[PDB]
Amino acid sequence: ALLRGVFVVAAKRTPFGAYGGLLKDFTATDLSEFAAKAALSAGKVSPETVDSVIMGNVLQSSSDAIYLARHVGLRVGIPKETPALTINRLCGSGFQSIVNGCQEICVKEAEVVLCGGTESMSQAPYCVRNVRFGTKLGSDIKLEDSLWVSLTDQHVQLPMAMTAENLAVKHKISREECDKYALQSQQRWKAANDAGYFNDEMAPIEVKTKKGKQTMQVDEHARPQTTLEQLQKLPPVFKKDGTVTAGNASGVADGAGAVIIASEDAVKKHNFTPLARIVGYFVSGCDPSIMGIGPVPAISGALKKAGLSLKDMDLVEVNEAFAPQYLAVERSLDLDISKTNVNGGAIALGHPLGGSGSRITAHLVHELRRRGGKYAVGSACIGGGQGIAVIIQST
Amino acid sequence: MALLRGVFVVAAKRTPFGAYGGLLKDFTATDLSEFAAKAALSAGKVSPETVDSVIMGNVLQSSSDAIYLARHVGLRVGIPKETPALTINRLCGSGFQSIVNGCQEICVKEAEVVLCGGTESMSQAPYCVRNVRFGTKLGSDIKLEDSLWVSLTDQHVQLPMAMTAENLAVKHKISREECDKYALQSQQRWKAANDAGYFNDEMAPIEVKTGKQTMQVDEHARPQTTLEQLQKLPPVFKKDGTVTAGNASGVADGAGAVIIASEDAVKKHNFTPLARIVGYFVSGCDPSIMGIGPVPAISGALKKAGLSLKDMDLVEVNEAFAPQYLAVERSLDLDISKTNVNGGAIALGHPLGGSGSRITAHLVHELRRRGGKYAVGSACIGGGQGIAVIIQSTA
């Protein structure tokens, strides 16, 4: 039960770029700026009204990274007196920014919070470690790929994909079932995109092509000519006879979102248009070896706190990190597929780590309204063994 | 604006601070945070099973496991896997900010007991190779970019941190001589306090290699410093400037851990409280003079707590640069006999994420040693912010 009412007054997200694709030259700061500017504009929220900036970002991937939230705030015209915070709850960061914004409003340290999520995975650097203070002749120094090493949880020494294979084994999910889920995500993404279901949320970006400047407004990672036959032919990537392939895992990607939230007092004072109310949220830890299950206790705990049941949810979103991971969650919670990831997910449009939770939230806000539904919950598993969920109510 | 629930410090520890390339260089920021957290758990007789949330400040990701930091710390020190873990970045203020986030969580009843730390390994800051994933142009000038060095410039205003301090020196008419005398005083105060045992209760000693020895003294300090030696140093960034290597804080390695608890938790678990958190405040300011952050931060925090500067028995203003500190002292008319009484970052260094945790932990213990009632700790924040936290000693 939130101590004060907290309302979403704007929600936008960039198109998601493929790894090395159309957005590769924009930093995570840049992408976040683009989403935030679009949100301010779409909500007719004056920057002057923003009291706090909170950005989710996981992997620092530019020379200006440590300043990310502050630079976004300043670039979009929010006053210099407004403070700025960057947070990291890995894959859940896009949802977490909103959770921190809710807390600030609820203890009356803010009235209006810009809560975003962003990631540029294309920009993840190579790191040279241990050479500041001399080297030993004959040592084995790496140009370490900061992205690749970050996709292994060194506490349990598992790649994220292997934590998904664990769930495939535990929940009896076959390779065939994973590929069918992947196909459905592609189909759903395609249907939704072509129907306009991403129009209200989309923050188009001007990009360079060999054809000159163009407006990017469609997700680049999506593969709308996918067939089950093609997916069946892909080899498992991490495990012999495993379930996880390049076709049924989420892609590495670039992207951002921005959700602006406000107290009731602020909505009235500034004549904002509330689009949803934040009803509840929950963060839980879980076993790092099966981190993909995070959404199970996170959704359950959030529902419990809000006094709601899964049957009350018109929409559920569970971030598609890996098909077998998602399917495990579907089976554990007995989710109704007709109301879950209805417009595709990260298998189709990618998983920019910090950005996915902002996109999911922004999508739920607009899609819940489009359907005339009452409640939705968005969630993500989190590398290292956490989960997060946020429940919204249409206004 | 009182905290919605009482929040009490039940443990506060911090590691010795290591010099750049010094005694702690092989320990990751995760390692240092683990050490401080383990020392705090022990000092407060807090069972790891009682901790509901782990929040760690860390600024510059400097190890291959960095994105998982808070989660790994929590798991390594025995906190249950169900307890969630967040890493936050408000640059130089991060060590104070972790505590502020913990207060918020307790106040909205999402936690009862929070482990709130701050950590940095600046020795491990990598060199980054950028823009080589997707091909290079023959004749491009690829750098092994020093991630630390580039992070010490705010690219929004294109100023090294030291140049923002020169701006304050010009604005407030602070001479080079006055900066060097402030620096000498910090070295003298550090030395007197260390030898008197005033860092004993806070210190979380670490076993290091030399054979094995116990490190329990700050390594950056230069206790034979003289005004003449300082007078000979050249200004580093500005012709005839005030900032030198001798009167700026040093790059360093270190961490701290503060455990906070609700009143209910203190009573339920029979904790003995060391201080109560009375208030805090975060403010933005002009990035070109970011060092002035503590002025609105302290003023705002005092306002919210219903206190005045005269009520403070101790004030801490992180010593990022002597002229930056002196600009704060002048703007608020601080009493030097109650401000940075036991030295600061000029003497013992500024591990970005760790300084705010050390300051807090130092105030908790030093306030009790003096028999005082209130103290406020603060830091300027690169990019143009300030943070302050006020404590009250508790019987």
Side-chain angles (χ1 to χ4, degrees):
Chain A
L2 279 76
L3 295 183
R4 306 170 73 190
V6 177
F7 298 87
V8 176
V9 297
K12 300 291 279 187
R13 66 82 165 186
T14 68
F16 280 13
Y19 177 72
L22 293 168
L23 300 175
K24 71 176 178 167
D25 294 323
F26 288 123
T27 67
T29 305
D30 293 341
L31 297 179
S32 175
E33 177 195 357
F34 306 150
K37 174 169 188 190
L40 290 163
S41 173
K44 297 175 174 88
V45 179
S46 166
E48 194 79 7
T49 65
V50 180
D51 294 319
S52 183
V53 178
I54 308 175
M55 293 290 151
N57 181 236
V58 179
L59 188 48
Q60 288 172 348
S61 56
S62 65
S63 69
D64 57 346
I66 68 168
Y67 293 84
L68 191 145
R70 181 65 173 166
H71 287 182
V72 170
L74 296 171
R75 290 180 189 187
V76 303
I78 292 168
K80 73 190 190 301
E81 290 75 24
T82 291
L85 181 67
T86 302
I87 61 86
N88 165 26
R89 206 189 296 275
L90 292 88
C91 314
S93 293
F95 292 114
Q96 182 61 47
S97 60
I98 298 166
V99 171
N100 287 116
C102 285
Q103 291 163 351
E104 294 192 354
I105 288 170
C106 286
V107 303
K108 305 198 180 198
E109 294 164 19
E111 296 298 311
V112 178
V113 188
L114 167 65
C115 308
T118 181
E119 205 78 43
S120 172
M121 304 183 74
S122 296
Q123 293 200 2
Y126 289 97
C127 299
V128 179
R129 303 191 188 282
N130 307 312
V131 308
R132 286 179 182 274
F133 311 112
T135 61
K136 252 146 243 286
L137 182 61
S139 55
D140 196 7
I141 303 160
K142 306 147 180 195
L143 216 65
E144 192 172 283
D145 182 330
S146 59
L147 176 51
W148 193 243
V149 307
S150 293
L151 299 174
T152 290
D153 175 355
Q154 294 177 220
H155 190 76
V156 293
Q157 293 298 351
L158 293 172
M160 290 301 94
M162 286 297 309
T163 72
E165 297 287 5
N166 288 343
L167 286 170
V169 168
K170 182 178 177 172
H171 296 268
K172 298 167 281 159
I173 302 165
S174 67
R175 164 68 189 271
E176 203 185 2
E177 294 162 335
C178 294
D179 287 343
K180 288 178 158 80
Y181 183 78
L183 180 61
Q184 178 174 95
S185 179
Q186 299 289 358
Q187 293 170 344
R188 288 174 169 199
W189 176 86
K190 167 67 162 156
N193 180 82
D194 295 359
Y197 295 169
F198 302 143
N199 289 352
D200 288 357
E201 80 197 56
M202 194 67 72
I205 293 166
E206 170 176 282
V207 298
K208 296 191 83 98
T209 68
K210 302 189 268 164
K211 296 191 207 182
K213 292 179 192 179
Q214 293 187 283
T215 297
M216 185 190 185
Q217 52 199 343
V218 184
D219 294 310
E220 180 183 15
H221 189 68
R223 289 181 291 256
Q225 305 314 306
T226 296
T227 65
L228 187 64
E229 175 177 25
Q230 293 168 324
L231 291 169
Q232 285 168 344
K233 291 199 227 105
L234 299 172
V237 172
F238 292 89
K239 179 180 175 179
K240 189 163 184 70
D241 304 313
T243 61
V244 178
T245 70
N248 68 21
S250 60
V252 171
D254 302 330
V259 179
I260 301 181
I261 61 182
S263 71
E264 184 183 345
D265 294 311
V267 165
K268 287 180 183 179
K269 175 168 177 185
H270 303 296
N271 196 31
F272 295 149
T273 298
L275 303 175
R277 187 183 174 121
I278 307 291
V279 172
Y281 52 76
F282 191 62
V283 188
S284 181
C286 64
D287 183 354
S289 294
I290 50 168
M291 65 91 199
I293 212 71
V296 181
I299 290 170
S300 314
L303 290 167
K304 181 166 180 189
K305 282 163 71 193
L308 295 173
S309 82
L310 248 191
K311 294 171 183 175
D312 296 317
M313 298 298 107
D314 294 285
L315 292 171
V316 177
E317 285 273 321
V318 175
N319 191 40
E320 301 181 343
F322 307 92
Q325 165 271 327
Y326 164 74
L327 288 172
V329 171
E330 182 188 280
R331 292 183 195 190
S332 308
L333 290 172
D334 188 27
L335 299 177
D336 177 354
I337 81 170
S338 74
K339 302 178 178 187
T340 305
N341 293 349
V342 302
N343 292 322
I347 290 159
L349 48 57
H351 177 32
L353 307 178
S356 291
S358 306
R359 176 191 69 73
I360 293 165
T361 308
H363 184 65
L364 284 180
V365 169
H366 297 294
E367 178 69 359
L368 185 61
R369 290 174 72 80
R370 191 197 63 83
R371 287 175 171 239
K374 185 174 187 186
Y375 292 116
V377 59
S379 65
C381 66
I382 296 178
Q386 308 187 59
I388 188 160
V390 180
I391 301 167
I392 71 166
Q393 184 179 349
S394 178
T395 49
Chain B
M1 299 173 56
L3 275 74
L4 295 184
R5 305 169 71 187
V7 179
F8 297 82
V9 177
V10 298
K13 299 292 281 185
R14 65 83 164 186
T15 64
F17 283 11
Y20 175 76
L23 293 169
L24 300 176
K25 72 175 177 164
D26 294 324
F27 289 122
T28 68
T30 306
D31 294 345
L32 298 178
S33 175
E34 179 192 1
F35 306 152
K38 178 168 189 191
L41 286 165
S42 178
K45 305 147 184 89
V46 179
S47 163
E49 286 79 10
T50 303
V51 176
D52 293 317
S53 184
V54 178
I55 308 175
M56 293 290 152
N58 182 234
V59 180
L60 189 49
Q61 288 175 345
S62 55
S63 66
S64 71
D65 56 348
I67 69 167
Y68 295 84
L69 191 145
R71 179 66 172 162
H72 290 182
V73 172
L75 294 170
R76 290 179 188 190
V77 304
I79 291 166
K81 73 189 188 301
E82 293 74 22
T83 290
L86 184 65
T87 304
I88 61 85
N89 167 25
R90 206 190 295 281
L91 292 88
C92 315
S94 292
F96 293 113
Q97 182 60 49
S98 64
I99 299 166
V100 169
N101 287 118
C103 287
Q104 290 162 352
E105 293 192 351
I106 291 170
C107 288
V108 304
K109 306 195 183 198
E110 293 165 18
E112 296 297 312
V113 179
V114 188
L115 168 63
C116 304
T119 182
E120 204 78 41
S121 173
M122 305 184 71
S123 296
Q124 295 199 359
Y127 289 97
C128 297
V129 179
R130 302 191 189 281
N131 307 312
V132 310
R133 289 179 182 274
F134 312 115
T136 63
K137 179 134 159 46
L138 180 62
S140 56
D141 192 5
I142 304 159
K143 304 157 169 256
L144 241 72
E145 191 174 282
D146 182 330
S147 60
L148 174 53
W149 196 246
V150 307
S151 292
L152 301 173
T153 289
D154 173 358
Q155 296 179 217
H156 189 78
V157 292
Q158 292 298 353
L159 293 174
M161 290 301 94
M163 287 297 308
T164 72
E166 299 285 8
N167 285 346
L168 287 171
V170 169
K171 182 179 177 174
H172 294 266
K173 295 163 206 88
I174 301 167
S175 68
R176 160 69 187 269
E177 204 185 0
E178 295 161 335
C179 298
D180 287 342
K181 289 179 158 80
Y182 184 78
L184 178 59
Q185 178 174 94
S186 176
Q187 298 287 1
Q188 293 173 339
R189 287 175 167 197
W190 178 85
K191 168 67 161 156
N194 180 79
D195 294 356
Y198 299 173
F199 302 138
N200 291 354
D201 289 354
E202 79 198 56
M203 193 70 72
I206 293 165
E207 171 177 281
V208 297
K209 297 194 247 102
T210 69
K212 291 180 192 178
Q213 293 188 284
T214 298
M215 183 191 185
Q216 52 200 344
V217 183
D218 294 310
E219 183 183 18
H220 190 69
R222 287 182 292 260
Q224 305 171 355
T225 295
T226 65
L227 187 63
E228 291 76 25
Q229 292 165 19
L230 293 169
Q231 287 168 343
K232 293 191 192 175
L233 299 171
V236 172
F237 294 94
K238 179 180 176 178
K239 189 165 182 64
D240 303 314
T242 64
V243 179
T244 70
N247 67 25
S249 59
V251 173
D253 303 327
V258 180
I259 302 181
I260 61 184
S262 70
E263 188 177 347
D264 297 308
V266 165
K267 288 178 182 179
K268 174 168 178 184
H269 302 294
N270 306 119
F271 296 145
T272 300
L274 303 173
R276 189 175 62 97
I277 306 292
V278 171
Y280 52 76
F281 191 60
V282 187
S283 180
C285 63
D286 183 353
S288 294
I289 51 168
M290 65 95 200
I292 212 71
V295 179
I298 288 170
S299 311
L302 290 169
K303 279 160 182 188
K304 282 164 72 194
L307 295 172
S308 81
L309 250 190
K310 293 172 180 176
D311 298 317
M312 300 296 107
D313 292 288
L314 291 171
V315 174
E316 286 273 321
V317 172
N318 193 43
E319 298 183 344
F321 307 90
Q324 165 271 321
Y325 167 75
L326 289 171
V328 175
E329 182 190 277
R330 290 183 193 188
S331 306
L332 290 172
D333 189 25
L334 300 177
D335 180 353
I336 81 171
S337 73
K338 301 178 178 187
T339 306
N340 293 345
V341 304
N342 292 323
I346 288 158
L348 46 60
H350 176 33
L352 307 179
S355 290
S357 306
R358 177 191 68 71
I359 293 166
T360 308
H362 185 63
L363 286 179
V364 168
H365 299 291
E366 177 68 358
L367 183 63
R368 289 172 73 78
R369 192 199 62 87
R370 287 176 169 234
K373 186 175 180 84
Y374 294 113
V376 59
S378 65
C380 67
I381 295 177
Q385 309 187 61
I387 188 161
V389 179
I390 304 168
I391 70 163
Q392 185 180 350
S393 66
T394 60

